[PDB]
């Protein structure tokens, strides 16, 4: 009989092409074999699609459309070099996303869309391209950290999802530590909010992660603050401003829900 | 064809038209030249009208030497006769010109001083006739782009000229304008004393006032009586017409005189305020030549001529529109049909890279740059480039990519980025969705159906450059999407019909050039989702008729496609599979 | 040598440097394409290791130092004046070899391209020099493709210098490729670079080849050939009219073309002179033809606005009467019987003149040639004769294409060679001197 | 400072007024003769409201002095069209614009 | 062609072995095909052995052993799903002490003088996990306070038992049958 089905037709076409010619293009070979695997693994398509499937009521359709448009703008800003106009657009998109009610009402959709990962890599771009050469675009780092702290506070599962990015955040836990008016807007603040008042996550905290913070605090206790002495502050031997903020994260790591995590 | 000779060439596109092919040519196995072709062969003929082209390095008569400009010497371009004093030398007047023109002002206003040098619009170049070369055989001055007069006997009296005399109502001529393509003087008449060249090379100096259009000539430091007045916006090319009486003929000196700017400033915009004379590599000597081909158009205007009556005279009637895509060379003030670039390789390559730069400057949602580019490349130009069958393959691909990037890429990328997410509202339309269209468990055609999953909103902005608003810059420029759909469908149908015959004349010259741009535009439209119902049915019939028959012409999948075409058919099949997955997800949500 | 020491006493290893540069380029030659995958991978690994070792030993700075100390001399003649004549001969070759070596050292190496950012500003400053432009451009392209830090450091001045390279050196596709690489690298677009390139290149419309759609324009002429010569049996004054039965102002996005007037031939050849057979050119687009579109007088592709009562573009039911005076060169027009306050004068009369109309699609016009070939709507000006009076006694007047090729089947198309000169157009009676 | 050539006459009676929309087809050309904008190319009539500062002032009064059904040539000096800054990417600085404008309808 | 694509991808120069979904899918497909699994007859046992040998030949005739060695070598001692799939495919093609596969694997290594293969093997062994009292006690405390377990297996303790077992089973199959040459080569 004839193929009568798209899956059968695709399988026959790929097999026939491959056995007809020795394909010189590795991209063509890869595409054909991916398509063949998709035809023979139709279950896997559902397995990958259903976790990304969300249903909403009719009343929330307009708000979901607006939030999706904002998320699309933010996602499309990933393919452009970060500048002043890009910073403004990303900030306004984030602001619209906070102001949207769906962000609060449906944390599961918000997590399924991978908004936290998008804002994470947006912050990663600037951190990599402008931590060592002084913090360029500080407003982006502050806004991204504020968004990520609100994301953690929305739901416990969002906090657990952000807990998986702890190692990178603790690596970049020296971005805006000495600068004021950025309290609650630094990667250390996001790291603290990823573990704040969660016994399971506090227990899941490892020893090397705490060792990293202890080393940072020892460095702050030994060496003065370069940016403060550049602005002209008197040169004392140690760094109270950064030391206090590291001590705050250690406090949040060791104390949970009125009790002390002994481990 | 010789003088008064009439002939006809038959390429045997229609084999029946060949008179003697059957008796001789057919049995021996010879094939008609145009046997496996779908469209008429483009015929190139010898150009009657000579054009200015750069002197070849292998030219057997003329050699051009670019003498560098030292501190004490101006940059020089020396034209010499290679084969002089030997047999076969051409003792005919040779017309020379410089590549770039001086452009007069749009509106004519009614120790060197630096302020004067900066505020002046007067430019100067000089020509040195070497000793031993008769100045009566040498002419110096300016010409326009309209100059195409190749006569072995040239004199200033025979130059083409016209005097437009605009008059008032009662008849007074309030202005009279002389127009010509040759504003030049003879060095022989400038040599009044005589022996002005033998002791030292005769030195004609050409002075042009771009602000007033006044052309004055100075010879050996004294100002000649002959002068010219040109109209505003006239483009004047430095030109020397000389008949060689010496191995060394003349020299293009690019120097400057007191209170006058060198030619380089008026030629080049970057050097507008640079009093030091310059001879950039762009400036080169060109000569009038007859070795050039001309491309006969594939189609001509259909015009009917007949005698209505003795009283009514002869009727001339043209009613069917016909257009061609014209490529303009800026510095030479010339225009050629873009279809000619099948034989000018350097222009074709430069224009393909220009199209690539156009596609790159507006890449990744640069909507303001796309709006700006809509001025340079208009939608009728894009449509003509997309549909034309005689277009070069490189330009075809470039224009397809330009159309996609300017008008479709942003929304296509947004939909591709939101593709793997299924946010479906729970409405009556969603609840009505089922896995199978009817009781028979037979899959419906992919794409066709009712999909309620949320999708990005498609918005476009009108590209108008007379408004002063700024909200229009966001959103991609608007395009006639329905016309694009219909033309893409008909092109795909024609390509499917023609490619099965394996013609030796595919659009663009290769099967890849024929299919890859068309299939790419088709895939972009499909991803955007502009196609709806019956259009998608025609699409599925074209792709694979037997499988997608709705409840022997072969489709694309079994047409022996190249690897690049296969790579895009894989993308199309991938999108169809994604559509099926989305339909399954929506049916599951409906059951839930 | 720069310290003005004697050339003879100082040693300059010209031949050794040239041979080592050739050997070094061979050392850093990239793997060839026809090789197998494993061999190509091994060669690529060896090349990468060589580049890394050279960069760690800082040979790029040494090459830059040699290039800088060679650029102090502006020409091979200058270098042969300072150093030896052999050095002057080899100066250009050594510069080219050094630039090729730099390109080979930094090609495909992300770390080397990132370290060359500090020197990129130094590199672009010599882009204008003709002896190093190609090498500098190749190095710039190699750095821009690999390193994003290069795009970060590139600024408006560097972009304007790159564009001035096109402006001064002419059309070069490599500069366009460099500009393309300046916009997007590794899938990330630099919007500032895009905006700068657009705003500094596109609006000029003087370097890139401009493109437009032009309506096809055809010209139609009668058989009559009108010329003036000394002692010739030809009348100097002629008159004809054009009837505009219908015209559509916009059949397409471009305005409809409709021009009427007189045109002349080059010499005595019957073929119209000065114009191309096909294209968008019509009456008045060259210095051999003279036109009137209802609002302007056209000659040499230049239009001047001419006044007229109720002046307008040629519309339906318009009468255009064209007068040609060959005794004193003059072409005058009268629209709808009213004089047009403008005329062509003092043109070249060494040729044959004929009536001509140029048009695009969307017209319907009628020639009124006088007599039984059209009835004049208005009386001819005194002295002027109808154009039907110029037909030779045996020939028959007809209106045909001005050019020899028209729309027809290809195999039925009559290809035409050069036509004979129409010397018998002007009958000059020359008696035999006796 | 708008130079008005008439190509085709209009009724000469129905001029645009305050608070009216003008429906026009226009073709924009630089002084050198190069087209930069055309509503006929897009095949859509252009609409603007008199006195709302929606278009450049040269084009504004150029259409205002016109009549219904009139085809006119509008020459806008740089002081009434984009100034010395120009339009980025389309109109160069200090450019004089020529417009072929037809007043199709007033509504 | 697919096995050659995988081999070329493994032989291409990368700093890290990127995860390839096509590879994880097709390596699993090939591994399952090569094994396809109360007293039974001797003829039945021989038929099973011959069918297993034919299924393994279906792959190692097309270059599967070289590809699975190349992937392990390119892994550079980094534990991952790619390495786990490669080890499973190697075990599938090496089950039963397949002498032809052992000879092909030894000959390829001897010809190419591959040091990265053994370096990656040592790195993978060093990266293999063990029992963790600290993690087990933290999990027990988390259950004592009664929080819901995200995973009940406590996989943080003994992170990759299957990966460690597959890694050592691959090396055991490499020496099955008293293969003295490869025993000395290791």
Numbering used by the authors:
A (entry chain A): 2053 to 2315
B (entry chain A): 1207 to 1316, 1414 to 1854, 1889 to 1929
C (entry chain A): 436 to 869
D (entry chain E): 2 to 108
E (entry chain A): 3666 to 3702, 3710 to 3858
What does the report in the manuscript say about this coordinate set?
We chose the CPVT-related RyR2-R420Q and RyR2-R420W mutants because they are among the most frequent mutations reported in CPVT patients. Moreover, by analyzing two different mutations at the same residue, we were able to determine whether the identity of the mutant residue differentially affects the local and global structures. Recombinant human isoforms of the PKA-phosphorylated CPVT-linked RyR2-R420Q and RyR2-R420W channels were expressed in HEK-293 cells and purified as previously described. Under these conditions, we found that the pore of the RyR2-R420Q and RyR2-R420W channels remained closed, but the cytoplasmic shell exhibited a downward-outward movement compared to the closed WT RyR2, reaching the primed state. Calculation of RMSD normalized projections showed that the RyR2-R420Q had more pronounced conformational changes compared to the RyR2-R420W, but smaller than that of another CPVT mutant channel that we previously reported, the RyR2-R2474S. However, the mutant channels in the primed state revealed that the NTD-B is rotated relative to the NSol (2-4°). In the mutant channels, the NTD-B domain rotates and separates itself from the CSol and the NTD-A- domains, weakening the inter-domain interaction and promoting the primed state. In WT RyR2, R420, located in the NSol domain, interacts directly with the NTD-B domain. In RyR2-R420Q, mutation of R420 to the smaller residue Q420 results in the loss of both interactions made by R420 in WT RyR2. In this case, disruption of such interactions results in a 0.7 Å downward movement of the loop formed by the residues 298-304, which contains both interacting residues R298 and V300, leading to the rotation of the whole NTD-B domain.
Ryanodine receptor type 2 (RyR2), an intracellular Ca2+ release channel located on the sarcoplasmic reticulum (SR) of cardiomyocytes, is essential for cardiac muscle excitation-contraction coupling. Structurally, RyR2 is a 2.3 MDa homotetramer consisting of two functional regions: a massive cytoplasmic region, also known as the cytoplasmic shell, which comprises several regulatory domains (NTDs, NSol, SPRYs, RYs, JSol, and BSol domains) and the stabilizing subunit calstabin-2, and an activation core and pore region, which comprises the Ca2+ binding site and the transmembrane domains. Dysregulation of Ca2+ handling, characterized by aberrant SR Ca2+ leak, is a pivotal pathophysiological mechanism in a spectrum of cardiac disorders, including heart failure (HF), atrial fibrillation, catecholaminergic polymorphic ventricular tachycardia (CPVT), and other arrhythmogenic disorders. Here, we solved the cryogenic electron microscopy structures of ryanodine receptor 2 variants linked either to heart failure or inherited sudden cardiac death.
